[PDB]
Amino acid sequence: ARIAGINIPDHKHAVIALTSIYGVGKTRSKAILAAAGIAEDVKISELSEGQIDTLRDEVAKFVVEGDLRREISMSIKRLMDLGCYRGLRHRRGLPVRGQRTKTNARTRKGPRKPIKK
């Protein structure tokens, strides 16, 4: 099929399309489509079948959320369980990789303490 056989987006020119397909951003999106010999300067729509059917396979190399995003998660879930000062800080849900806190947690945590309760 036209679409990548794993999962669904649609439309737009091929180059932007693989982070729409998912799990591969721009650097992999140029290189992966180019290795297959598939253009950036085309609609998703027009694709000759030898490019698409090969695209459905040439994708199959890389990311699918079903095991992968869960697995990359399960590595963190283990970290959250492991007994580390690095993971413990992932458990409480503050910034923990880079930052410290005067007032700097909205990116990680979403809101400040909210509402009337």
């Binding site: 492991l82 580390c84 000062y85 690095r86 413990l88 800080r89 409480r92 990789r97």
Partner: protein, 91 residues
Amino acid sequence: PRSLKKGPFIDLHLLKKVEKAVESGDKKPLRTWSRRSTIFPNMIGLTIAVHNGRQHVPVFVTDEMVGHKLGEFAPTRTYRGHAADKKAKKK
């Protein structure tokens, strides 16, 4: 994340405790004035007491502890109750 020495990393002060222990096995845990360190297999299965800045907290070393820094596995500050709300302490 941030990454490690581009050469060894082993730290040898806590090795300096470990090197007479390591083939002696199970006893009173190693009190570390050296939390800087990595953790790897040579240190597996001993109980290495990790300086929090004032007192050593035992970490028993196992597979997960091939990973990473030693200190990384273990507290220094008492990060408290969420929002600085609690009326007990755990010294």
